[PDB]
Write a protein that binds this ligand. Structure first.
Ligand code: A5G
Length: 346
């Protein structure tokens, strides 16, 4: 009873709140009217809107209620806290010094709101269902006492799956892999971070006019050619990190459906991660980052259509090097080991 109250105070404190606020304090009429649904998961819904002439992405998660939502029970205050903490910590890495990366996504704000679902969001939900189709329950059954966590992120671009046919050349592919590896290495070094769910819908790409991107790993600064794209890694629902010996993580040791999926290499990775940590998810195993990078390199080699010329000796050489990376990267222990020791990045 007191533990439930402690869990609640921790979440409200992360939100700079004393208690829940109404949906309006957070999504007033104008912002609601500009919402469009852009994604979904068992977790809930993601909308795109505009806040002060800037695009933002808003993730809405029902918490603490008894109803089934998209086939699963809602997370409690205790269970939602890790995603909040991790989103905050990875957003900070863009402004750090010794371990600095722009490769995650900025978190503008996080709120705990109370109310039934806004009709305007239901209308956006319906439009998505009509056009793209939806696996989720229409979220119209929540009562006016229902709590939600509302995470407002910087808008990070289009996901790698939807950019399948839009990359210019194999040079762009190598830059994307280099950006992902460097971002994960910086998070390993700073926070002993594992993403644990880096499928290609969680890799976003935005056009940039910067020719060189920068990161700093343990005080050493390096550059990566942008090839006109800036990568952002998103969605920390399953992630793990630690600060001063205190681990923050998603405890999936009683979750069964996560390890029974089929039809994609993605679902073999959950089973391999479980095998390698003996189902002890607080432990640090940065090899899981390598597994996800390996899955992403497979996508790069098998699913991408390029706009520019592929038969030039230079591009054929890049392809050979990404193939060699694909067949050797599993012999490295971490993203940091890949970044610093793999020949692809030399
Ligand atoms: C269909 C999809 N794979 C691409 C479009 N899509 C987008 N989601 N986000 C986010 C974002 C979302 C969730 C989150 F936990 C953190 C975030 F930062 C930021 N910018 C964008 S585009 C939804 C997923």
């Amino acid at each position: 009873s007191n533990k439930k109250a402690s869990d609640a105070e921790k979440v409200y404190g992360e939100c700079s709140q004393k208690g829940p606020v109404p949906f309006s304090h957070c999504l007033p009429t104008e912002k609601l009217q500009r919402c469009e649904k852009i994604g979904e998961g068992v977790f809930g819904e993601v909308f795109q809107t505009i806040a002060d002439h800037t695009p933002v992405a808003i993730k809405i998660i029902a918490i603490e209620g008894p109803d089934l939502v998209n086939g699963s029970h809602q997370k409690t205050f205790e269970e939602i806290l890790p995603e909040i903490i991790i989103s905050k910590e990875l957003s900070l890495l863009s402004g750090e010094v010794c371990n600095r990366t722009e490769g995650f996504i900025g978190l503008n704000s996080v709120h705990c709101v109370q109310g039934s679902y806004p009709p305007l969001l239901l209308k956006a939900w319906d439009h998505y269902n009509s056009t793209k189709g939806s696996a989720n329950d229409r979220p119209d059954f929540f009562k006016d006492d229902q709590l939600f966590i509302v995470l407002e992120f910087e808008f990070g671009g289009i996901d790698l799956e939807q950019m399948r046919t839009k990359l210019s050349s194999l040079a762009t592919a190598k830059s994307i892999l280099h950006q992902l590896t460097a971002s994960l290495a910086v998070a390993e070094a700073s926070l002993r971070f594992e993403h644990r769910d880096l499928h290609w819908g969680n890799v976003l790409l935005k056009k940039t006019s910067l020719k060189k991107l920068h990161y700093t790993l343990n005080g050493k600064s390096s550059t990566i050619p942008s090839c006109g794209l800036q990568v952002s890694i998103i969605d920390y629902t399953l992630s793990r990190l630690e600060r001063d010996g205190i681990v923050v993580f998603c405890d999936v040791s009683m979750d069964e459906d996560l390890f029974t999926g089929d039809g994609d290499y993605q679902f073999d990775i959950y089973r391999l991660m479980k095998k390698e940590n003996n189902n002890r998810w607080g432990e640090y195993h940065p090899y899981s980052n390598v597994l996800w990078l390996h899955y992403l390199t497979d996508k790069m080699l098998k699913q991408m259509t390029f706009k520019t010329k592929c038969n030039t000796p230079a591009m054929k050489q890049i392809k050979r090097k990404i193939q060699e990376f694909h067949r050797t990267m599993l012999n490295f222990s971490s993203a940091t080991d890949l970044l610093c020791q793999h020949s692809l990045f030399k």
